[PDB]
Amino acid sequence: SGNSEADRQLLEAAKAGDVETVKKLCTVQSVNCRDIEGRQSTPLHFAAGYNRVSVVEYLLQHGADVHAKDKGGLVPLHNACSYGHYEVAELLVKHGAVVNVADLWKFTPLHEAAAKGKYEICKLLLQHGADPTKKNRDGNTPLDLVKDGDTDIQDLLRGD
Amino acid sequence: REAGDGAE
Ligand SMILES: *Cn1cc(CCCc2cn(C*)nn2)nn1
């Protein structure tokens, strides 16, 4: 259908970072469409995971859903944190993303940012109340997932 | 647990 090809091209443009094509194709129907043949990601999940800051900014200003979950329960903030994209993470939080959201495995954005060792994202999340003591379904807190070698991030999450 | 869509 007209909508399906356009949804596909929008998802592709969001992944590619092509903001002019995103603007061209963004409709109420497409803006939060799901990638049915993949993991049910929205355009925002793609823009966030692939570090497409201008596209994130456009999407957020035209009603994209910061809280949308992919098939694993990931929200766009999870993709930003797991792939280490700070500006995207900041934008999402500024537009209401919940830093304590949990996926189906009970991993939060801080579990992801802690494992990845991204200081600025860990700081952003902690300043907005991310819990460094919250256990996922492995029994691991974000502090537990800090790589054993990564002393600087360990110190940051300890806080106190 | 498979990764979300994106790349480092
Ligand atoms: C769960 N998961 C998958 C990956 C890497 C997927 C392949 C890739 C994507 N980009 C930019 N570089 N390699 N990481 N975590």
Q: How was this structure determined?
A: X-ray
Pocket test for ligand 1, best of A41, A52, A78, A82 (most atoms within 8 A of CB): A82
Helices (H), chain A: 2-16, 19-25, 43-49, 53-61, 76-82, 86-94, 109-116, 119-127, 142-145, 151-158
Cβ contact A81:A115 at 8 Å:
no
Give CATH superfamily name and number for A1-160.
Answer: Ankyrin repeat-containing domain (1.25.40.20)
CA-nearest residue, atom 5 of ligand 1? B7
A1, A16, A48: which is closest to B3 by C-alpha? A48
**Contact status, residue A30 vs residue A44, Cβ threshold 8 Å:** no
Taking the mean position of all CA atoms in its chain, how far away is CA A110?
11
Query: Cα(A160)–Cα(B8) distance, rounded to whole angstroms?
Result: 31
How far apart (Å, rounded) are the C-alpha atoms in residues A79 and B6? 7
Give the span between the Cα atoms of A128 and A40, in whole angstroms: 28
Mutate to test the pocket of ligand 1, among A39, A78, A83 (most ligand atoms within 8 A of CB): A83
* C-alpha radius of gyration, chain A, whole number: 16
Residues counted in chain B = 8
**A90 in Cβ contact with A97 (< 8 Å):** no
CB-facing half-sphere around the CA of A95: CA atoms within 13 A = 21
- List the domain boundaries for chain A: 1-160
Closest CA to A102 of A93, A94, A113, A111: A111
Q: Looking at residue A34, what DSSP letter applies?
A: -
